[PDB]
Design a protein around this ligand. Structure first.
Ligand SMILES: CCCOc1ccc(CCc2nc3cc(-c4c(C)noc4C)ccc3n2CCN2CCOCC2)cc1
Length: 116
């Protein structure tokens, strides 16, 4: 059954792309940095970005999980790749962890709104 309409899901995912992250998760790593084709995919054989997630949202990929698990998995993959590739103690990892707490807050606020 369809729980979350495509147009709400597109709006939710677009809302996660904010200026505070200075484009860190806006787009596919390889599209932006083609020199990383072999280096990135060796460390991160599975990847995602907020433009890809918005495309997935628009195609209804996220509408069928009560807890939006499929979307949350695409956010965790972005965040976990950023931390693994740049190193867990560095500034890119800090930026990832701050992004993740915000993104998860925003996703949970939307689920609350849909029940109330
Ligand atoms: C303060 C700690 C974080 O440091 C930052 C320092 C700089 C930036 C902006 C530049 C920048 N460095 C990026 C790194 C990745 C990347 C890599 C490599 N491995 O994992 C990830 C994730 C992705 C996007 C990035 N972008 C954005 C590029 N858009 C800029 C605007 O026009 C389109 C391209 C962002 C954050």
């Amino acid at each position: 059954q369809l729980l979350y309409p495509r147009e709400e899901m597109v709006s939710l995912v677009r809302s996660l792309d904010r200026p505070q992250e200075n484009g860190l998760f806006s787009q596919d790593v390889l599209l932006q940095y083609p020199e990383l084709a072999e280096s990135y995919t060796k460390v991160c054989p599975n990847r995602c970005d907020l433009a890809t997630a918005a495309d997935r949202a628009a195609k209804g990929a996220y509408g069928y999980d009560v807890q939006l698990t499929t979307l949350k998995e695409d956010i965790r993959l972005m965040v976990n790749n950023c931390i693994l590739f740049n190193g867990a103690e560095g500034a890119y990892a800090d930026a990832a962890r701050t992004f993740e707490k915000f993104a998860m807050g925003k996703i949970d606020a939307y689920i609350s709104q849909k029940v109330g």
